[PDB]
Amino acid sequence: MHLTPEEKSAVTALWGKVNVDEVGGEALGRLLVVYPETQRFFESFGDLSTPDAVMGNPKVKAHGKKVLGAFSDGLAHLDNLKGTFATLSELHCDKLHVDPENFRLLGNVLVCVLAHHFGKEFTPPVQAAYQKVVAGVANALAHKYH
Amino acid sequence: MHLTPEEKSAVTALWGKVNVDEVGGEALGRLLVVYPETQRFFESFGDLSTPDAVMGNPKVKAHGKKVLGAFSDGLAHLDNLKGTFATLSELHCDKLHVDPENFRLLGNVLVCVLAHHFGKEFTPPVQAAYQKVVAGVANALAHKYH
Amino acid sequence: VLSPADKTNVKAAWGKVGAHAGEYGAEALERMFLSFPTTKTYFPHFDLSHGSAQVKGHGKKVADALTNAVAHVDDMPNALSALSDLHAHKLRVDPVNFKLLSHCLLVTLAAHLPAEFTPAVHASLDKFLASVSTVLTSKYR
Amino acid sequence: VLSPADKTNVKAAWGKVGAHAGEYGAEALERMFLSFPTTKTYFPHFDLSHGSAQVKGHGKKVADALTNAVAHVDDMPNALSALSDLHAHKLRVDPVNFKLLSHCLLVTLAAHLPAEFTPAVHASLDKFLASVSTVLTSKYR
Ligand code: HEM
Ligand code: HEM
Ligand code: HEM
Ligand code: HEM
Numbered sequence: 001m002h003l004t005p006e007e008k009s010a011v012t013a014l015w016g017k018v019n020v021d022e023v024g025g026e027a028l029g030r031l032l033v034v035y036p037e038t039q040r041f042f043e044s045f046g047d048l049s050t051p052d053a054v055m056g057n058p059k060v061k062a063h064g065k066k067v068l069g070a071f072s073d074g075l076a077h078l079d080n081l082k083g084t085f086a087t088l089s090e091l092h093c094d095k096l097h098v099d100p101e102n103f104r105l106l107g108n109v110l111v112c113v114l115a116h117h118f119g120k121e122f123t124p125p126v127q128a129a130y131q132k133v134v135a136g137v138a139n140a141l142a143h144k145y146h
Numbered sequence: 147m148h149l150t151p152e153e154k155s156a157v158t159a160l161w162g163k164v165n166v167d168e169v170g171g172e173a174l175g176r177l178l179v180v181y182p183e184t185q186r187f188f189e190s191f192g193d194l195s196t197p198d199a200v201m202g203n204p205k206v207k208a209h210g211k212k213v214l215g216a217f218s219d220g221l222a223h224l225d226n227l228k229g230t231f232a233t234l235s236e237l238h239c240d241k242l243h244v245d246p247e248n249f250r251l252l253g254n255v256l257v258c259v260l261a262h263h264f265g266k267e268f269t270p271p272v273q274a275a276y277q278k279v280v281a282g283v284a285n286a287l288a289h290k291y292h
Numbered sequence: 293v294l295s296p297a298d299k300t301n302v303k304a305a306w307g308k309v310g311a312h313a314g315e316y317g318a319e320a321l322e323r324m325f326l327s328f329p330t331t332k333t334y335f336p337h338f339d340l341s342h343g344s345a346q347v348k349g350h351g352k353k354v355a356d357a358l359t360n361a362v363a364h365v366d367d368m369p370n371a372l373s374a375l376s377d378l379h380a381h382k383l384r385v386d387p388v389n390f391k392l393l394s395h396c397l398l399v400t401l402a403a404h405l406p407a408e409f410t411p412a413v414h415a416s417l418d419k420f421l422a423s424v425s426t427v428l429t430s431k432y433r
Numbered sequence: 434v435l436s437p438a439d440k441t442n443v444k445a446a447w448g449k450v451g452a453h454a455g456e457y458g459a460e461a462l463e464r465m466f467l468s469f470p471t472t473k474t475y476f477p478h479f480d481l482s483h484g485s486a487q488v489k490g491h492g493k494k495v496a497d498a499l500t501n502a503v504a505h506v507d508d509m510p511n512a513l514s515a516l517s518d519l520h521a522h523k524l525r526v527d528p529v530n531f532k533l534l535s536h537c538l539l540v541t542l543a544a545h546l547p548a549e550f551t552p553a554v555h556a557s558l559d560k561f562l563a564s565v566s567t568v569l570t571s572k573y574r
Binding site: 054 | 326411
Binding site for chain 4: 035036037040093097098099100101102142145146
């Protein structure tokens, strides 16, 4: 990862203020609402017919939280994303059949949700550092596709 | 760069059979004809208005040979593509202002020209090895962009 | 495809941006140049320093065009004719770059209009910016 | 857009392809699966082994669809209507994947049609595949 010390701490300081329950459900929820193609993978989650149904769905919310916890592990092992996400890489490939192109979509919704929550604090330089991280994650998740 | 020793040997074996002078001119020529938006970068080459004007242009053919020579340097240093192309990356960025998306277009055109020349020798497995190589070269040429 | 529902959301949202659009345009470009450095290759004759007067001014021109597209949402192709020629035939901007500018716009709106940026509105704006991008890259080849 | 010249080029090339269409289709698919493994995620239910009959079989279907597009070159959006609903609404295939299949087909025609694959014909075939991919991806939301 081409992250600078100023950026690594830019990311870390912000991350410590993140409400994982709110941001996780909001990110996974918006993924499903803004890019309805992705619902194909969550048909087992139940009712996802409308925005209000997606955003209020307890399995959506709970799963979002899990996704953020894995993101968290990545921020703590930034110099080794490839090794941190390897198992999850194999999982999303072997069991779930997810096209890695979807990983970029979640990264970007994620960035939009951070901006929604932090306002002024999510300044252009902070977003740039988050953009590098989210790409890092997306690449790490695609690495074991075969 | 994930090249197994078999892929590496497949890449290197085929490449010994290539006439770089010829292949270079064909590859850069087809880029300018198939993706004519790239022509904005070479207005000093003269007339590029028709396919023949392009394919037979002596400046096109000379420049194509330059490009394929740098490509050859890359094949001899597969385990350090980023260092090999560092000065070329900066130049394509700072001096020529070329959007790196264009590197992907050339890599693909080059793969079509190889298939055109070698025919059935250019098998599915050999192609796969070549894609990983042109993707690696494109990523290396893009790394010093800032 | 822009549904009437989408059109209603876009009109609402854009109406809320009101006279701040110019500011949001310049911020979106700044975010783009920092986050995605490759987009700078199209602006070598620009002074791209933070707070740059060129970027500010160009930000206003981008916002006004989008203001125009909202007003002409059922007819975007005709009303964006000139810009489409300029982007697809003169500048020859690779389509990928439009996805980068749209995301940066969405970030900007998210950062400044927290109450209006609902999941439904987000979706609508995203489809709106995709449609604009399609029209601006269409007559390429 | 297609030009009259592009249509002529596409019809001649596709005409030389002939009965071999199905075989080229199958090759394209194989090249795709090996060169770009992410594509396999859309076929978890296929046998994708080298030489697979399911792949040979699927190849023929893709080839026939293209043959139909060539027969209705002036009305592709309606001729590929049912395939557009399939790809874009039931399978929900991300658009980058079409560029990869398009490229692999081009590699396949280049390897089998040495004499036909001139720069001009290569330019036309690329635009045609782009037009087909656009239609199949058109109702994406
Ligand atoms: C930053 C990118 C992503 C991260 C970090 C991530 C992380 C996770 C994690 C932690 C799990 C739970 C795995 C376990 O049980 O051990 C999960 C499961 C899953 N993910 Fe993701 N994921 C990402 C992107 C996606 C995308 C984009 C999709 C699909 C569009 C997706 C679809 C799934 C599905 C279908 C499951 C299984 C859920 C279930 O148990 O029913 N994920 N992923
Ligand atoms: C494998 C990918 C590529 C390689 C290895 C490559 C290599 C080269 C080399 C060696 C030069 C000569 C450098 C010099 O003058 O000092 C060159 C110059 C140039 N390259 Fe590339 N290049 C690549 C892709 C591209 C692409 C795709 C474009 C643009 C579409 C591009 C546009 C140029 C231009 C405009 C020049 C200067 C031309 C002149 O003499 O006026 N290159 N590149
Ligand atoms: C929502 C998408 C976009 C809109 C609405 C937009 C709008 C504009 C407008 C209004 C102009 C001024 C043209 C005039 O004077 O009539 C402009 C010029 C320009 N645009 Fe965009 N644009 C968009 C996306 C892009 C992208 C993605 C790039 C490239 C990454 C780009 C690069 C340029 C450049 C280089 C100019 C010429 C600047 C100059 O020298 O004055 N635009 N565009
Ligand atoms: C030239 C562009 C393409 C054409 C003309 C094409 C044509 C077809 C046709 C004719 C079918 C059969 C429909 C039927 O069963 O009646 C098909 C099914 C399918 N296609 Fe494509 N296709 C294209 C691109 C793709 C791409 C890019 C992917 C994904 C990487 C893809 C994945 C599928 C899948 C998964 C099926 C269903 C397989 C099955 O269950 O039988 N196709 N397509």
